[PDB]
Amino acid sequence: RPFQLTHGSIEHTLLVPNDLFFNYSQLKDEFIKTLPEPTEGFAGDDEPSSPAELYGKFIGFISNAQFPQIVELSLKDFESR
Amino acid sequence: RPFQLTHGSIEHTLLVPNDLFFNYSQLKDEFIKTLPEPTEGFAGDDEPSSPAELYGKFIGFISNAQFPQIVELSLKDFESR
């Protein structure tokens, strides 16, 4: 089932497995409140500005939350994508 | 558990079963990005403008996605409703 990270006018849709999507979403709910508001062409320094960058921030966020078997799965997902 | 399709100022709430709601929602996530913006009384031609019409578009969308046992279930749901 497809998963979609969203921020502003750019999104990164990736295919997570079926029996992970419940607790894959729990990391994204903690992720969207860590990002600032989209501002005038994404020129804020802490704000991501590419789908490779917005999914790049999410792969850094999920390593701070003690919840494995998603980090290395999204790591191999980052390399194949 | 109740399911709700939304677009604009009209919605169609329907009762899906318990053990379908996970992958019933995956079709709706692909559905909401196929509809345009609500415009001034729903007068766009590709835009639906009734709950019988907004659920009428969703029963057409899920036949393009190769994912049975929901199409004929929403078909009999369309007839009984």
From Swiss-Prot, chains A, B:
State the superkingdom.
Answer: Eukaryota
State the family named in the UniProt similarity comment for this chain: Belongs to the fungal fatty acid synthetase subunit beta family.
Describe its assembly. Answer: [Alpha(6)beta(6)] hexamers of two multifunctional subunits (alpha and beta).
Q: What does this protein do?
A: Fatty acid synthetase catalyzes the formation of long-chain fatty acids from acetyl-CoA, malonyl-CoA and NADPH. The beta subunit contains domains for: [acyl-carrier-protein] acetyltransferase and malonyltransferase, S-acyl fatty acid synthase thioesterase, enoyl-[acyl-carrier-protein] reductase, and 3-hydroxypalmitoyl-[acyl-carrier-protein] dehydratase.
**Which protein, by its recorded name, is this?**
Fatty acid synthase subunit beta
State the species of origin: Candida albicans (Yeast)
- Gene symbol? FAS1
